Amino acid sequence: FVEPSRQFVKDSIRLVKRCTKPDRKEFQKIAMATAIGFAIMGFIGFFVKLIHIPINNIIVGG
Amino acid sequence: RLLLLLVVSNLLLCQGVVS
Amino acid sequence: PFCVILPEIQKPERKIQFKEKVLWTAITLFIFLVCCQIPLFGIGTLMELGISPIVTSGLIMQLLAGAKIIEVGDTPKDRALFNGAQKLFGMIITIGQSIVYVMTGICLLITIQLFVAGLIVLLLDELLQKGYGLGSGISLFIATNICETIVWKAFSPTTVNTGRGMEFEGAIIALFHLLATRTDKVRALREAFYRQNLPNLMNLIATIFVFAVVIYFQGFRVDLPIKSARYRGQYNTYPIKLFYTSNIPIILQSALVSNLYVISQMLSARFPVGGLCHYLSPPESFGSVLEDPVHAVVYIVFMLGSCAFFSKTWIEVSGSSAKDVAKQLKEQQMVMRGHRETSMVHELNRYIPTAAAFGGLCIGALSVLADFLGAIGSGTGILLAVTIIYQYFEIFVKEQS
């Protein structure tokens, strides 16, 4: 029991020291890039809803 | 390979629990 | 004979410039979110099924490809009989889902339009896959997430539901309206057990926090040198990424082991909301041990185990093993800088296995941060946004160059 785990952990503790790992210049890429999607999506997802609430019974003004 | 057939049999239920 | 019947998009007559390719996505992205409202003709939207039926059949045909029931060929002919077959499974599966979505609970009209809705996106998909950087099956998973995120995060519906409030009745309750009134006296929010439920805005910064830790692990990769044959010292790389498996099928297994476990208790009554589900699924109590310790111990380890187990099996099917990658490279005439071909297997094998699993074991614990945090995404697929986000920006840089 558990003897494989002490080798699993040691084998998996390798690839973390081996891996590249980012630093802020790449950390900033992905941070900036999060802002990109955000700004394009919204607009429509708000147009969609305004058409339907005042057609069945007027309660907003659209 | 038994465990692999069970994986395919699991995956098939993904399409059954879309509903 | 079937592949010839169905339509495909023309490969563009020549090269296309990025201003055009970007304006093709304004089109498809406008049209998807136009499709994600309009309700079907039941006397609810058009995008009810989505791309998930095509994706999942993609996975079923990829596991039929990988399990070696049907043969796979890197040669273009066996691919030419398969790439149409896959799209045909994508065409049938949306008809199957047209039946399956309705049957569980006017019909045929609705099935025709769900079929058409699934069909249109399958072409809109392929449009982007030729006249844009990146596909589409992907794109929609962004599109229908970041919107839901920002709506549920900084739209006015705190008024009702779990989503913000901290009021026993109606009152005035919008995400920004409470930020004006909570500043005057006490916030009430500190490092403690708390009233529970409360609002979601405080959760929100947590949802940004797992966002901001996911990005870190989306960098994490191992590099293996790759100089092709027949070209003096041209240093291509091959990345083995820490996550790997895109950790998509693992969470699908996480859902499947919940779907087989929770139905077979309802099968046993014909021949328990308490006992059976009280040890498997989580408490969804904010705290660590809480009143019941045994609920907290069984939920975690089993998920991180069963997620990992399924990862290490996935690789034995969908190529992406030691043995297969090598083939894949050997085909396109690539090699390690100083090794005989066969050795490749060995020299990269010791990277794959670990990864396959350790990704899983990092995603099981990331479902745990997401569930324990009660984050606004409330799921592992925050990851999925950033994966794609990274991919998109990189194209913007490619086309900038």
From TrEMBL, chain B:
GO process terms (BP): positive regulation of biosynthetic process
Main location: secreted
Position of the signal peptide: 1-19
GO cellular component terms listed in the entry, alphabetical order: extracellular region
Membrane-spanning intervals of the chain: none
GO molecular function term, any single one: hormone activity
UniProt subcellular location: Secreted
Entry keywords, A to Z: Disulfide bond, Hormone, Metal-binding, Secreted, Signal, Zinc
Family, as annotated: Belongs to the somatotropin/prolactin family.
Name of the molecule in the record: Prolactin
Species this protein is from: Bos taurus
Location of this fragment in the whole protein: 2 to 20 of 60
